[PDB]
Enzyme design. Structure first.
Site, PDB file in Angstrom:
ATOM      1  N   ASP A  95       0.907  -0.998   0.214  1.00 45.54           N
ATOM      2  CA  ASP A  95      -0.106  -0.032  -0.003  1.00 45.54           C
ATOM      3  C   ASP A  95       0.774   1.238  -0.037  1.00 45.54           C
ATOM      4  O   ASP A  95       0.598   2.279  -0.653  1.00 45.54           O
ATOM      5  CB  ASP A  95      -0.878   0.088   1.222  1.00 45.54           C
ATOM      6  CG  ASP A  95      -1.885   1.150   1.381  1.00 45.54           C
ATOM      7  OD1 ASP A  95      -1.399   2.397   1.689  1.00 45.54           O
ATOM      8  OD2 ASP A  95      -2.909   1.179   1.045  1.00 45.54           O
ATOM      9  N   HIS A  96       2.211   1.213   0.700  1.00 47.11           N
ATOM     10  CA  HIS A  96       2.867   2.441   0.868  1.00 47.11           C
ATOM     11  C   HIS A  96       3.834   2.448  -0.368  1.00 47.11           C
ATOM     12  O   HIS A  96       4.428   3.621  -0.309  1.00 47.11           O
ATOM     13  CB  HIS A  96       3.461   2.443   2.183  1.00 47.11           C
ATOM     14  CG  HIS A  96       2.704   2.484   3.407  1.00 47.11           C
ATOM     15  ND1 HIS A  96       1.277   2.542   3.322  1.00 47.11           N
ATOM     16  CD2 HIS A  96       2.952   2.457   4.712  1.00 47.11           C
ATOM     17  CE1 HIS A  96       0.795   2.351   4.613  1.00 47.11           C
ATOM     18  NE2 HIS A  96       1.941   2.568   5.496  1.00 47.11           N
ATOM     19  N   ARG A 234       5.495   7.275   6.423  1.00 49.32           N
ATOM     20  CA  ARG A 234       4.739   6.358   7.310  1.00 49.32           C
ATOM     21  C   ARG A 234       5.564   5.097   7.942  1.00 49.32           C
ATOM     22  O   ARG A 234       4.959   4.442   8.424  1.00 49.32           O
ATOM     23  CB  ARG A 234       3.371   5.888   6.757  1.00 49.32           C
ATOM     24  CG  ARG A 234       2.574   6.921   6.239  1.00 49.32           C
ATOM     25  CD  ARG A 234       1.218   6.405   5.424  1.00 49.32           C
ATOM     26  NE  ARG A 234       1.835   5.902   4.096  1.00 49.32           N
ATOM     27  CZ  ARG A 234       0.632   5.417   2.959  1.00 49.32           C
ATOM     28  NH1 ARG A 234      -0.272   5.193   3.390  1.00 49.32           N
ATOM     29  NH2 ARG A 234       1.464   5.443   1.966  1.00 49.32           N
ATOM     30  N   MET A 238       4.234   1.425  12.607  1.00 44.32           N
ATOM     31  CA  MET A 238       4.349   0.398  13.463  1.00 44.32           C
ATOM     32  C   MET A 238       5.887  -0.414  13.344  1.00 44.32           C
ATOM     33  O   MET A 238       6.219  -0.450  12.051  1.00 44.32           O
ATOM     34  CB  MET A 238       3.345  -0.534  13.524  1.00 44.32           C
ATOM     35  CG  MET A 238       3.028  -1.520  12.368  1.00 44.32           C
ATOM     36  SD  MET A 238       1.510  -2.391  12.144  1.00 44.32           S
ATOM     37  CE  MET A 238       1.022  -2.936  13.739  1.00 44.32           C
TER      38      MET A 238
HETATM   39  C1  HEM Z   1      -1.684   1.690  11.904  1.00 48.48           C
HETATM   40  C2  HEM Z   1      -2.238   1.005  10.797  1.00 48.48           C
HETATM   41  C3  HEM Z   1      -1.759  -0.334  10.237  1.00 48.48           C
HETATM   42  C4  HEM Z   1      -0.871  -1.387  11.261  1.00 48.48           C
HETATM   43  C5  HEM Z   1      -0.694  -2.646  11.218  1.00 48.48           C
HETATM   44  C6  HEM Z   1      -2.387  -0.500   9.044  1.00 48.48           C
HETATM   45  C7  HEM Z   1      -2.517  -1.808   8.226  1.00 48.48           C
HETATM   46  C8  HEM Z   1      -2.617  -1.893   6.817  1.00 48.48           C
HETATM   47  C9  HEM Z   1      -2.913  -2.701   6.071  1.00 48.48           C
HETATM   48  C10 HEM Z   1      -2.572  -4.409   6.303  1.00 48.48           C
HETATM   49  C11 HEM Z   1      -3.321  -2.577   4.784  1.00 48.48           C
HETATM   50  C12 HEM Z   1      -3.591  -3.072   3.604  1.00 48.48           C
HETATM   51  C13 HEM Z   1      -3.365  -4.572   3.293  1.00 48.48           C
HETATM   52  C14 HEM Z   1      -3.427  -1.219   4.838  1.00 48.48           C
HETATM   53  C15 HEM Z   1      -3.772  -0.283   3.965  1.00 48.48           C
HETATM   54  C16 HEM Z   1      -4.129   1.076   3.885  1.00 48.48           C
HETATM   55  N1  HEM Z   1      -4.249   1.868   5.089  1.00 48.48           N
HETATM   56 FE1  HEM Z   1      -3.854   1.115   6.698  1.00 48.48          FE
HETATM   57  N2  HEM Z   1      -2.845   0.566   8.671  1.00 48.48           N
HETATM   58  C17 HEM Z   1      -2.929   1.588   9.624  1.00 48.48           C
HETATM   59  C18 HEM Z   1      -2.997   2.635   9.672  1.00 48.48           C
HETATM   60  C19 HEM Z   1      -3.622   3.550   8.724  1.00 48.48           C
HETATM   61  C20 HEM Z   1      -4.314   5.009   8.968  1.00 48.48           C
HETATM   62  C21 HEM Z   1      -4.160   5.591  10.158  1.00 48.48           C
HETATM   63  C22 HEM Z   1      -4.841   5.196   7.856  1.00 48.48           C
HETATM   64  C23 HEM Z   1      -5.467   6.617   7.536  1.00 48.48           C
HETATM   65  C24 HEM Z   1      -6.839   6.603   7.991  1.00 48.48           C
HETATM   66  C25 HEM Z   1      -7.683   7.850   7.386  1.00 48.48           C
HETATM   67  O1  HEM Z   1      -8.694   7.656   6.780  1.00 48.48           O
HETATM   68  O2  HEM Z   1      -7.418   8.796   8.147  1.00 48.48           O
HETATM   69  C26 HEM Z   1      -4.641   4.132   6.894  1.00 48.48           C
HETATM   70  C27 HEM Z   1      -4.753   3.977   5.524  1.00 48.48           C
HETATM   71  C28 HEM Z   1      -4.636   2.974   4.752  1.00 48.48           C
HETATM   72  C29 HEM Z   1      -4.657   3.095   3.157  1.00 48.48           C
HETATM   73  C30 HEM Z   1      -4.981   4.360   2.556  1.00 48.48           C
HETATM   74  C31 HEM Z   1      -3.621   5.067   2.275  1.00 48.48           C
HETATM   75  C32 HEM Z   1      -3.809   6.482   1.683  1.00 48.48           C
HETATM   76  O3  HEM Z   1      -3.717   6.560   0.394  1.00 48.48           O
HETATM   77  O4  HEM Z   1      -3.471   7.381   2.362  1.00 48.48           O
HETATM   78  C33 HEM Z   1      -4.367   1.994   2.857  1.00 48.48           C
HETATM   79  C34 HEM Z   1      -4.376   1.385   1.263  1.00 48.48           C
HETATM   80  N3  HEM Z   1      -3.973   3.272   7.446  1.00 48.48           N
HETATM   81  N4  HEM Z   1      -3.303  -0.786   6.224  1.00 48.48           N
HETATM   82  F1  LIG Z   2       3.794  11.833   7.586  1.00 51.46           F
HETATM   83  C1  LIG Z   2       2.309  11.504   8.017  1.00 51.46           C
HETATM   84  C2  LIG Z   2       2.400  10.287   8.621  1.00 51.46           C
HETATM   85  C3  LIG Z   2       1.224   9.793   9.042  1.00 51.46           C
HETATM   86  C4  LIG Z   2      -0.206  10.405   8.607  1.00 51.46           C
HETATM   87  C5  LIG Z   2      -1.535  10.099   9.074  1.00 51.46           C
HETATM   88  C6  LIG Z   2      -2.502  10.037   8.034  1.00 51.46           C
HETATM   89  C7  LIG Z   2      -3.955   9.741   8.539  1.00 51.46           C
HETATM   90  N1  LIG Z   2      -4.306  10.862   9.383  1.00 51.46           N
HETATM   91  C8  LIG Z   2      -3.391  10.894  10.667  1.00 51.46           C
HETATM   92  C9  LIG Z   2      -2.219  11.077  10.052  1.00 51.46           C
HETATM   93  C10 LIG Z   2      -1.080  10.908  11.389  1.00 51.46           C
HETATM   94  O1  LIG Z   2      -1.135  12.265  12.179  1.00 51.46           O
HETATM   95  C11 LIG Z   2      -0.395  12.228  13.332  1.00 51.46           C
HETATM   96  C12 LIG Z   2       0.088  10.956  13.767  1.00 51.46           C
HETATM   97  C13 LIG Z   2       0.716  11.050  15.162  1.00 51.46           C
HETATM   98  C14 LIG Z   2       0.651  12.269  15.908  1.00 51.46           C
HETATM   99  C15 LIG Z   2       0.294  13.602  15.212  1.00 51.46           C
HETATM  100  C16 LIG Z   2      -0.397  13.403  13.846  1.00 51.46           C
HETATM  101  O2  LIG Z   2       0.451  14.530  15.997  1.00 51.46           O
HETATM  102  C17 LIG Z   2       1.300  14.175  16.836  1.00 51.46           C
HETATM  103  O3  LIG Z   2       1.332  12.763  16.853  1.00 51.46           O
HETATM  104  C18 LIG Z   2       0.239  11.701   7.930  1.00 51.46           C
HETATM  105  C19 LIG Z   2       1.244  12.278   7.559  1.00 51.46           C
END
Ligand code: HEM
Ligand SMILES: Fc1ccc([C@@H]2CCNC[C@H]2COc2ccc3c(c2)OCO3)cc1
Ligand SMILES: *[C@@H]1O[C@H](CO[C@@H]2O[C@@H](C)[C@@H](O)[C@@H](O)[C@@H]2O)[C@@H](O[C@@H]2O[C@H](CO)[C@@H](O[C@@H]3O[C@H](CO[C@H]4O[C@H](CO)[C@@H](O)[C@H](O)[C@@H]4O[C@@H]4O[C@H](CO)[C@@H](O)[C@H](O)[C@H]4NC(C)=O)[C@@H](O)[C@H](O[C@H]4O[C@H](CO)[C@@H](O)[C@H](O)[C@@H]4O)[C@@H]3O)[C@H](O)[C@H]2NC(C)=O)[C@H](O)[C@H]1NC(C)=O
Ligand SMILES: *[C@@H]1O[C@H](CO)[C@@H](O[C@@H]2O[C@H](CO)[C@@H](O[C@@H]3O[C@H](CO[C@H]4O[C@H](CO)[C@@H](O)[C@H](O[C@H]5O[C@H](CO)[C@@H](O)[C@H](O)[C@@H]5O)[C@@H]4O)[C@@H](O)[C@H](O[C@H]4O[C@H](CO)[C@@H](O)[C@H](O)[C@@H]4O)[C@@H]3O)[C@H](O)[C@H]2NC(C)=O)[C@H](O)[C@H]1NC(C)=O
Ligand SMILES: *[C@@H]1O[C@H](CO[C@@H]2O[C@@H](C)[C@@H](O)[C@@H](O)[C@@H]2O)[C@@H](O[C@@H]2O[C@H](CO)[C@@H](O[C@@H]3O[C@H](CO[C@H]4O[C@H](CO)[C@@H](O)[C@H](O)[C@@H]4O)[C@@H](O)[C@H](O[C@H]4O[C@H](CO)[C@@H](O)[C@H](O)[C@@H]4O)[C@@H]3O)[C@H](O)[C@H]2NC(C)=O)[C@H](O)[C@H]1NC(C)=O
Ligand code: HEM
Ligand SMILES: *[C@@H]1O[C@H](CO)[C@@H](O[C@@H]2O[C@H](CO)[C@@H](O[C@@H]3O[C@H](CO)[C@@H](O)[C@H](O)[C@@H]3O)[C@H](O)[C@H]2NC(C)=O)[C@H](O)[C@H]1NC(C)=O
Ligand SMILES: *[C@@H]1O[C@H](CO)[C@@H](O[C@@H]2O[C@H](CO)[C@@H](O)[C@H](O)[C@H]2NC(C)=O)[C@H](O)[C@H]1NC(C)=O
Ligand SMILES: *[C@@H]1O[C@H](CO)[C@@H](O[C@H]2O[C@H](CO)[C@@H](O)[C@H](O)[C@H]2NC(C)=O)[C@H](O)[C@H]1NC(C)=O
Ligand SMILES: *[C@@H]1O[C@H](CO)[C@@H](O)[C@H](O)[C@H]1NC(C)=O
Ligand SMILES: *[C@@H]1O[C@H](CO)[C@@H](O)[C@H](O)[C@H]1NC(C)=O
Ligand SMILES: [Ca+2]
Ligand SMILES: [Ca+2]
Ligand SMILES: [Cl-]
Ligand SMILES: [Cl-]
Ligand SMILES: [Cl-]
Ligand SMILES: [Cl-]
Ligand SMILES: [Cl-]
Ligand SMILES: [Cl-]
Ligand SMILES: [Cl-]
Ligand SMILES: [Cl-]
Ligand SMILES: [Cl-]
Ligand SMILES: [Cl-]
Lengths: 573, 570
Positions: A95-96, A234, A238
């Site tokens: 995804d990333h 990102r 984790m």
């Molecule tokens: C913490 C997060 C994870 C820890 C294990 C995690 C895991 C996944 C998996 C396993 C994915 C696909 C197989 C996956 C895809 C996408 N995620 Fe998710 N993810 C964690 C945390 C987040 C957060 C927070 C977001 C943003 C939520 C929001 O709407 O504000 C998130 C998004 C996505 C995403 C869309 C990415 C983008 O274009 O910004 C995936 C394709 N994940 N994650």
């Molecule tokens: F570089 C990037 C990483 C992660 C994202 C995420 C995308 C989804 N919306 C939440 C974002 C995380 O934002 C955070 C998380 C921890 C924090 C914080 C803000 O302020 C102090 O501790 C955005 C940009």
């Protein structure tokens, strides 16, 4: 215009497609597979104005839908007998590689205010919430940055900051400033920069980032360990993810080292590019050979990903807006702990299982609690969670997401749903139709589709019609395909997307002219267990298929048993 | 949010599609059926930077392509034995229901290439323009997102995409109210307060800052007309059709007042508007399009209507704005006027087109619309032939009277496709599921004309680079149609979406009663001419095919009128 010949990918993805050279490049609008559905036709998300219905029915609070449908008791969690937790983690890492949707910087302040003023779209709290008793509170949410800010004319679309291609941009970057900073410019060895303050039993860690507001520092004050710097921002979210990033850094540097031995007269640039080219191919091969078949199942894999023929310059390789939401199916695979194991694959003491709510942005746990080997072992030898219709996602992400570093714990399932509305995505039935699937109109028809009338009833109670079901929620509610871990709808979306990333990538590893026939023979031999062997202190790894093998010792082998990558065919006279 | 019930179209087209309510509405970006192709990937048109090639080959000057391929000697002109000039004119009028692409400082007098100007360079040995330091003026179309480095430049449609007679009623609410007679409760459109055409109505005059109609004559001092679309005065034949439909609205509102005396002005306006819209749909899909596409393509792209499909996107595609310009190949180099015996109406029975552009004075002072409508019905269209593509009245002398230099419409078509970042011929062939020629020999096969294939390859180097207009109109015509396979596909595909994705399509259950649809099936364009002019002898059958006096004509008394019985209420 584009160079008429070239040997390597650009960093930004510019010029992959020569006729429309921005396609799949970084910092461009997503493509839309369907016309957007906004409350006002062009900008405001459904749920924005209280009392305004969607397509005849009230909008359900994302948090309400999460509470009534996603929530389950954690003791009921079913482990997936046929999938490792490495299956979950490769999904996140992939995804990333594909998409990042940028938001405006914390600044009126969406993190501390519950006022709904642009660019904030906070999640309202329903009555009788299991956690948040004050209904005047909210879950923070920033709207995704629009491609055309302040326009009356354009239909709001969001931005992808990465290259769409499977090109290991999460390692190398998708912008040229960042891509140069990730490199070791001390010498002519073509290496990526490594941590200058710490090592993991003699092996490299990722460089540290220099952030204005660093969240990794908040997770342990005394440790003073900042977030890492990688191709994607990102990387520290984790430690399991950090592990994979670290693993691929090492693999780059290992390859550049071996190519230097083999071709002593190559400069730093040539070594960097050639190593990068291989790492990219390895990400492609693991993804399409090993990963995707286990996501889609064999039927959908044949349907959506038939045998590769050749590059097709008329295939649009952009990430679709809906994909950014549909590929979040992997949130259903997440276990509520980080599992660490010693070299006997035994609980590594003092804390073998850390709650997820305590590992987010905890870069200190990589530097000070045993490096990446224990984590990789935990991924290989622990089962993924299984998605079941009454056990969709765990409370460590539904109740306690980023708990340590924010004013309140987030709900990732609810964010998925608010985000789909933010992006103006159509509902379940519109996507069913797009995919050529039957569209249920009644609770009984939805019961048939889900093979579960109880769940169908809960969904209709929230949404009123299947037309209004949020794409994530509908997608992950569906019964799974035979030997896959998604239903038909997500299969269609995900399959369709990865086909375009393959057929429309000029630098796809099987495309004539990218690699010689001998280099392709050699690359066919790579695997992820092998990469772990080559770059860690681990000597016992998963049997192939690393994403299925999940039980020690039954599913494990010695590193010496596996074929290595033979770089013989990369030699030049 | 959209009204959950409604009886009539909005003016802007907002809310036709309830799930995505801007689809088909005015002042929105075009839809793209293919990704854009710009020199820099996102904004600059091919031909912008000297020396920059397209897809391996130099960009041909639009004016050079016009000179070498479109130009033909006017004495060779072939008349179409099977098409009236009314076929040409309904196409232009329909176009003005579907799409208008707005433009923005110095582009009219300067030949410097500075945004937003994209002037056409003059080739050496030009037949007309000897000064190579001169140029043909060109403003780039407005972008939907101005000044953006992120977005891929897209253009704007100022009209409703729907076939809704917006060229009569307007696509914006300010304009739509100004077009109405708000003096009374009769639901009428405003008519000219200074002139009449033998006692019948003319269009109101517009109040323009820089009025071009005044430049045409000058002693006459007759300004441009005001209609639903801003281009109503561009030629008097078009003006005639606009005028005809104004009258037809007012006639219907009148008859509905008799029939339903308690209806207010709003109800009469809407109900009349609703009918005029259905009439434009019916003439277009029943009479016009079959003769454009031919019977094969008509079955393929426009099968029998079933019902409204809310998942069909009804927006105009960017490519359509350029492809539907095929009708420039139908244009005769004169305006033909005929008396009530269908005989050359003196004085000046045949006026060169370069003297009718924006000549609103010729409607007011040279005998009104009846002679013009007669000329349309009883004269043949021009036939598109591969060595007789378009006449010099539009290629050499376009808008000659009202600006500093005569334009070249074929060349503008081609510069415009580049402005809009449209892919070349082969990408569109592929989009349509048609074979893509790579060599001159393959192109010869496709065009059934190796000579033309050779000329095109000399200009363009590859079929990948041929401008969509040029490629489209080069193709041999379908049996009983007036476009080739590629334009058939694009035009067919577009009109299918405008039909199946229009919630107010006249056959859609709930728009009209079953009795109203029975009645509407009887309308025709000859009938509308009868009802609203001093003409008593009109074209038979298919007005777009009937082109020869007396053979193809009938008396107005022989034709059924529209029975409004089923519009009556208690
Ligand atoms: C913490 C997060 C994870 C820890 C294990 C995690 C895991 C996944 C998996 C396993 C994915 C696909 C197989 C996956 C895809 C996408 N995620 Fe998710 N993810 C964690 C945390 C987040 C957060 C927070 C977001 C943003 C939520 C929001 O709407 O504000 C998130 C998004 C996505 C995403 C869309 C990415 C983008 O274009 O910004 C995936 C394709 N994940 N994650
Ligand atoms: F570089 C990037 C990483 C992660 C994202 C995420 C995308 C989804 N919306 C939440 C974002 C995380 O934002 C955070 C998380 C921890 C924090 C914080 C803000 O302020 C102090 O501790 C955005 C940009
Ligand atoms: C290289 O790759 C190109 C892209 O292929 C697509 O993406 C790849 C990754 C794979 O998933 C492909 O299977 C996928 O198709 C290929 O070009 C495409 O070829 C098809 C087939 O010839 C073209 O389809 C034709 O489209 C005509 C125009 O109408 C389209 O667009 C309208 C608006 O966008 C839309 O309303 C229409 O529905 C239609 O959209 C297509 O739908 C069909 C089926 O759902 C798909 O197959 C198309 O991909 C869709 N295209 C788009 C752009 O969204 C139609 O008139 C035409 O169909 C007609 O004729 C056939 C028989 O001749 C009849 O069955 C049918 O009755 C109908 O009347 C056809 O559907 C498509 O437009 C092409 N795309 C592009 C970008 O050019 C290349 O073929 C491939 N080349 C090689 C060598 O492999
Ligand atoms: C770009 O690429 C280069 C080359 O790949 C990277 O260089 C490495 O830098 C790191 C950290 O800055 C060095 O690690 C330190 O090592 C010293 C002692 O070095 C000795 O032991 C090494 C052990 O295997 C050995 O390789 C070294 O040999 C090389 O260097 C000598 C002398 O310059 C040279 O002549 C040889 O030919 C070799 O090239 C050498 O014998 C060690 O004392 C440091 O300890 C730190 O950490 C501890 C905690 O454990 C701390 O308490 C200490 O006080 C101290 O802070 C540290 O581990 C490594 O030696 C370098 N390797 C090479 C091959 O030169 C460079 O970092 C890259 N740049 C970027 C930005 O990534
Ligand atoms: C109402 O109209 C809807 C739109 O109708 C279109 O336009 C009208 C005017 C006609 O031309 C009509 O023929 C058009 O279809 C219509 O919905 C459409 O239905 C089709 C068929 O189900 C859908 O096509 C399927 O799409 C999926 C997704 O891929 C598509 O999108 C990608 C990305 O843009 C493209 O690259 C693809 O080429 C597709 O366009 C495909 O996976 C699927 O193909 C696969 O499955 C089929 C069937 O098994 C196989 O034959 C193929 O080989 C593949 O394995 C189809 O191509 C289309 O997406 C959908 N559009 C929308 C907007 O939903 C609807 O069905 C009509 N309904 C009624 C009630 O009349
Ligand atoms: C003068 C012009 C015409 C007749 C005297 C004429 C005629 C037609 C017919 C018959 C059409 C369809 C069958 C048709 C379609 C479209 N045209 Fe063309 N046209 C005249 C003049 C112009 C000019 C000038 C333009 C713009 C020139 C430029 O691009 O620089 C023009 C365009 C179009 C057009 C695109 C309209 C839009 O969306 O803005 C058609 C669909 N016509 N015309
Ligand atoms: C611009 O408009 C004016 C009218 O406002 C045009 O002038 C008109 O030219 C015609 C030419 O035939 C004149 O017709 C003549 O009328 C007289 C009187 O009946 C008759 O004896 C002649 O035999 C002929 O029929 C017309 O009267 C005249 N109108 C006026 C008011 O002067 C002018 O020609 C237009 N511009 C052009 C075409 O250059
Ligand atoms: C609005 O409608 C009224 C009535 O249809 C028009 O008034 C007529 O105007 C003509 C000539 O302009 C007169 O000779 C008639 O005697 C008038 N009739 C009536 C009943 O008063 C009026 O001009 C229209 N307004 C506009 C702008 O068109
Ligand atoms: C914060 O980081 C420190 C490292 O700075 C981690 O722990 C330390 O605490 C352990 C807990 O049992 C001790 O056994 C370690 O010896 C100690 N290390 C140092 C150098 O002080 C600490 O646990 C982290 N805090 C939390 C609550 O997780
Ligand atoms: C975009 O780039 C151009 C060209 O260098 C620059 O002049 C312009 O100011 C930029 N604008 C925006 C809004 O990014
Ligand atoms: C129309 O009526 C006239 C009498 O005014 C008659 O002479 C003529 O034959 C009729 N028909 C045609 C085809 O012209
Ligand atoms: Ca990428
Ligand atoms: Ca319209
Ligand atoms: Cl989408
Ligand atoms: Cl560092
Ligand atoms: Cl593969
Ligand atoms: Cl259930
Ligand atoms: Cl081990
Ligand atoms: Cl287009
Ligand atoms: Cl007036
Ligand atoms: Cl019809
Ligand atoms: Cl002038
Ligand atoms: Cl020829």
């Amino acid at each position: 215009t584009c160079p008429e010949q070239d040997k390597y990918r650009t960093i930004t993805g510019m010029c992959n497609n020569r006729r429309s050279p921005t396609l799949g490049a970084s910092n461009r609008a997503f493509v839309r597979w369907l016309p957007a559905e906004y409350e006002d036709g062009f900008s405001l998300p459904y749920g924005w104005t209280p009392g305004v219905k969607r397509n005849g029915f009230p909008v359900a609070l994302a948090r309400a839908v999460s509470n009534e449908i996603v929530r389950f008791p954690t003791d009921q969690l079913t482990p997936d007998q046929e999938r490792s937790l490495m299956f979950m983690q490769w999904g996140q890492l992939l995804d990333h590689d594909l998409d990042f949707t940028p938001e405006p910087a914390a600044r009126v302040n969406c993190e501390t205010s519950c006022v709904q003023q642009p660019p904030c779209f906070p999640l309202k709290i329903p009555p009788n919430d299991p956690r948040i008793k004050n209904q005047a509170d909210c879950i923070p949410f920033f709207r995704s940055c629009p491609a055309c800010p302040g326009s009356n004319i354009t239909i709001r679309n969001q931005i992808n900051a990465l290259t769409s291609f499977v090109d290991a941009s999460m390692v190398y970057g998708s912008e040229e400033p960042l891509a140069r900073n990730l490199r070791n410019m001390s010498n002519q060895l073509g290496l990526l920069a490594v941590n200058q303050r710490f090592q993991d039993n003699g092996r490299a860690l990722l460089p540290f980032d220099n952030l204005h507001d660093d969240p990794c520092l908040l997770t342990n004050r005394s440790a003073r360990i900042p977030c890492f710097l990688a191709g994607d921002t990102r990387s520290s979210e984790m430690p399991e993810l950090t592990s994979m990033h670290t693993l691929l850094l090492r693999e780059h540097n290992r390859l550049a080292t071996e190519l230097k031995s083999l071709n002593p007269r190559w400069d730093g640039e040539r070594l960097y590019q050639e190593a990068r080219k291989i790492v990219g191919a390895m990400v492609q091969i693991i993804t399409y050979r090993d990963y995707l078949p286990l996501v889609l199942g064999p039927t959908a894999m044949r349907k959506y990903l038939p045998t590769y023929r050749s590059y097709n310059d008329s295939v649009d390789p952009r990430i679709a807006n809906v994909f950014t939401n549909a590929f979040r199916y992997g949130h259903t695979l997440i276990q509520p702990f980080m599992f660490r194991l010693d070299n006997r694959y035994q609980p590594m003491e003092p804390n073998p299982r850390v709650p997820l709510s305590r590992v987010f942005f905890a870069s200190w746990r990589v530097v000070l609690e045993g490096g990446i080997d224990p984590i990789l072992r935990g991924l290989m030898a622990t089962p993924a969670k299984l998605n079941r219709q009454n056990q969709i996602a765990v409370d460590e992400i539904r109740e306690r997401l980023f708990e340590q570093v924010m004013r309140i714990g987030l709900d990732l399932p609810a964010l998925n749903m608010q985000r789909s509305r933010d992006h103006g995505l159509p509902g379940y039935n519109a996507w069913r139709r797009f995919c050529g699937l039957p569209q249920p109109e009644t609770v009984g028809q939805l019961g048939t589709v889900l093979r579960n009338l109880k769940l169908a009833r809960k969904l209709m109670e929230q949404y009123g019609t299947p037309n209004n079901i949020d794409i994530w929620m509908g997608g992950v509610s569906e019964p799974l395909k035979r030997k896959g871990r998604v239903g038909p709808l997500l299969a269609c979306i995900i399959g369709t997307q990865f086909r375009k990333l393959r057929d429309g990538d000029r630098f796809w590893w099987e495309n004539e002219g990218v690699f010689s026939m001998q280099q392709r023979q050699a690359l066919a031999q790579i695997s992820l267990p092998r990469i772990i062997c080559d770059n860690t202190g681990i000597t016992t790894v998963s049997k192939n298929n690393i994403f299925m093998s999940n039980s020690y010792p039954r599913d494990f082998v010695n590193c010496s048993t596996l074929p290595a990558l033979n770089l013989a065919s990369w030699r030049e006279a």
